[PDB]
Every structure is written in structure tokens, then in C-alpha cells.
Ligand binder design. Structure first.
Ligand SMILES: O=P(O)(O)OC[C@H](O)[C@@H](O)C(O)NO
Ligand SMILES: O=P(O)(O)OC[C@H](O)[C@@H](O)C(O)NO
Ligand SMILES: [Mg+2]
Ligand SMILES: [Mg+2]
Lengths: 215, 215
């Protein structure tokens, strides 16, 4: 209370990303360098966006799977505030990313996309990780996987373990009431903001509905 | 058939990578754009390296965790031959990456590490995936994880299921005999070639040892 709003910049080039930021940067709390942008442009995307929007939290959605220390340091030397580690990373990778995060006063989020287990979730807590991103995969969504009660149950379980939980994955405005009454940290929207006829109205509607559902 | 040798370019900038490729491009079979290089420079690394060495197999070690079709296509449009998909990816991510690979006459490898299961391995096979990378995480290695028996058994079992198995993760020359007798497709060396006093002789020593052990 209130859940923040994060825009995902899943763009292949910086100029494509800026078509969105130039409209909605001030309409959101967190600016994400999407994995698609990380791979498209590399870590310069993190450096550039933080330089443009230093007052915003910048998330480097690098989905680190190994070399936690090296990749985390690259992101944080580019001035990221937060970085993601994919759920299957070895626990030493997550720990390493977090050690480096702490040098920069940043933070690590575990990206829960695809396969993971409740035992891994406990390991993350024991290592001092305090953020997870409960993510429906884009590809799972495209094969017809809807949000369901099992998601709500799992989100609540993660919250109860002590994680600040981010909810994402093809979120539409209408999805937001599903999560009512859960202390969600952040809602991410990429396509439903970037690709809206009016990105400004789409971001303000997200913010409106959040304020209504968590006032 | 002799295991091939792949060099991993886990460099933060193209120029650092090229300090290695100018010495060993012709001394190895596969040139890998390491995840660290993909994140440092973005997908231009793939395009640039393939342009230098168009006769060599170039692997984009992107460790795709979601958006299989998009990230796959970015890599393949940059002229990659092979791309990696991290083992926890939703099965549709893996399938989407493969579908794109096939349009480019390329291929996908599932990068194993973290946690994964044998039923998941069977899903990969059923989906048409024909390569896996049995990797010891750099961070696990740093925490003292050694190559052992459980690894030989798992590698053998993966091979019997029909995968071509690449073995990687801080490999030193001295590790190769651990895997003798198994039809390994590829051994990857990053640090043990790049950081050798003489990268050329390091690569040659690996090829000599391979030739002895699999001859
Ligand atoms: O709302 P979307 O277009 O799905 O984008 C947000 C999502 O979190 C992606 O950035 C992502 O990381 N998917 O894995
Ligand atoms: O021999 P290394 O320095 O461990 O590098 C090879 C390894 O496969 C890495 O490139 C990697 O992908 N690690 O996850
Ligand atoms: Mg993202
Ligand atoms: Mg690699």
C-alpha cells in the first residue's frame, strides 16, 4: 500500500524504447530495461535510461542465470537500482548478485518464470532475498494460460514468507481486481502500456485502479 | 567421433573478445557469444563475430527464459547458428525458440542449471530439442562444487535419451578424463583458454587431450 507501477521496455532498440518513455516516464514509478532491450542494446540501455530518469527506480531485467557477481556488477556499474535473477539460477548465483547489489545500495529480485519449487523459495529467503517477480511467461500466455486461483494462492504464499511480490505477465487493467487485498509491491505492464492507443491514459488508468483497490 | 571444442567469449566488450578470437578462432570449432558479452554489447556481438568468422558455428549464449520467439529471432536475424534456452523456461518458450531456429536452419540448446527434472528432459525431447548443455555454474564452482559421479550418470542418461550433450563449467584440461567413454558432443572452455598465458597453446592442449581420450 500502494502497489507501484512499473513499465517494461521490451523493445529491441533504445529509440523504440524512447517512443514510450517520452510519453509515460513521469506516469510510472519504475522503468524496466526489458530482457529484450538488454539483449538488443546491452547494458548501455541501463546507463542511458538511468541518466535520462535518475529520479526513477531503474530495473535491469537481465534474468541472470549464472555468473551472478559479474552480470550484477555490470548492471550496477551502469546505475541500475534493481536486477532480476532467474528462478533456476544456482543459489550461489542469487547470493552473488545480492552481494554485489548491496555494494551499490540496490537490490535483487528473483524472476519466477517457468519452473521452480517451494524449497527454492525457502532458500531465497534464507539467503536474504526480499523480492520476487511472479511472472506468467509471455509464451505460456500465448498458448492460453490464464491467471487463476492457483496463482493467487502462490502469490499470497510468497507474500506470507516475507517477500515483496511483483505481479506481471501480460497484465491488463481488468486483471487488477484478481489481486485485491494482497500487499503487492509492484504491478508491471509492458504491452498494455506501450501498445495502448493512448499509453498515457493506459498508465493513468492502472494508477487510478490501483489507488481505488488498495485506498 | 571426437568431442568438438567451443570457446566461450564471456567478455564485457567486443574488443576484449577479439583479443581472444584473433588468437584462437581457427583453433576451435564453435565460437560462443557468452551471456556476459550478449549483456555487455547486445546482439551486435553475434552479428559482428559471425561477420568475422562466417565459416564457423556461432552460438549466442542468451539463456533465453521467456519470449522465446522474440529473443530467438533477434539472435538469428544477427546470424547466430545456435542459441541457448535456460532449462526452467516454460516449454512454450523452448518450442517458440526452436520454431524460429528451424526457419533459419539453426538450432536450440537447453542450458541445464539450477534445478530440472527428467520429465522436463522428456518434454524437451518430445518438443524436438536435440542438444543440452550440462553446465556447472561458475558460482557453484566458486563455492567448491566439483565434478563428480552424479554428473557422469546424468550426462550418460541425457545422451541415452537422444540429446547431444555439451559439457561445460570451469573445465580444466585435467577434467577431460572424467568424461572418457561418453559420446560428448562439445566441451566448452572459457577462462581456461582466454586467461591462459598462451590461449593458442591452451586450445591446442585441449584438442590433443580430446584426440587421445576419444581416439
Ligand atoms: O506486460 P508484458 O508485455 O507481459 O511485459 C511485462 C513482463 O514482465 C515482461 O517484461 C517479462 O519480463 N516477461 O517475461
Ligand atoms: O569455461 P568457463 O569460463 O566456465 O566458461 C564457459 C561456460 O559455459 C560459460 O560460458 C557459461 O555459459 N556459464 O554459465
Ligand atoms: Mg521483463
Ligand atoms: Mg556461456
Amino acid at each position: 500500500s500502494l502497489p507501484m507501477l512499473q513499465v517494461a521496455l521490451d523493445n529491441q532498440t533504445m529509440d523504440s524504447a524512447y517512443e514510450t518513455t517520452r510519453l509515460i516516464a513521469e506516469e510510472v514509478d519504475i522503468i524496466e530495461v526489458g530482457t529484450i532491450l538488454c539483449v538488443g542494446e546491452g547494458v548501455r540501455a541501463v546507463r542511458d535510461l538511468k541518466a535520462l530518469y535518475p529520479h526513477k527506480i531503474v530495473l535491469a531485467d537481465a534474468k541472470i542465470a549464472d555468473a551472478g557477481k559479474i552480470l550484477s556488477r555490470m548492471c550496477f556499474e551502469a546505475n541500475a537500482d534493481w536486477v532480476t535473477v532467474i528462478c533456476c539460477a544456482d543459489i550461489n548465483t542469487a547470493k552473488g548478485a545480492l552481494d554485489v547489489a548491496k555494494e551499490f545500495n540496490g537490490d535483487v529480485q528473483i524472476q519466477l518464470t517457468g519452473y521452480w519449487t517451494w524449497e527454492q523459495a525457502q532458500q531465497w529467503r534464507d539467503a536474504g532475498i526480499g523480492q520476487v517477480v511472479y511472472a506468467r511467461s509471455r509464451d505460456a500466455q500465448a498458448a492460453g494460460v490464464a491467471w487463476g486461483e492457483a496463482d493467487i494462492t502462490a502469490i499470497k504464499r510468497l507474500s506470507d514468507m516475507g517477500f515483496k511480490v511483483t505481479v506481471t505477465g501480460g497484465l491488463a487493467l481488468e486483471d487488477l481486481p484478481l489481486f485485491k487485498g494482497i500487499p503487492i509491491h509492484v504491478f508491471i505492464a509492458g504491452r498494455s502500456i506501450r501498445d495502448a492507443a493512448s499509453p498515457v491514459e493506459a498508465a493513468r488508468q492502472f494508477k487510478r485502479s490501483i489507488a481505488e483497490l488498495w485506498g
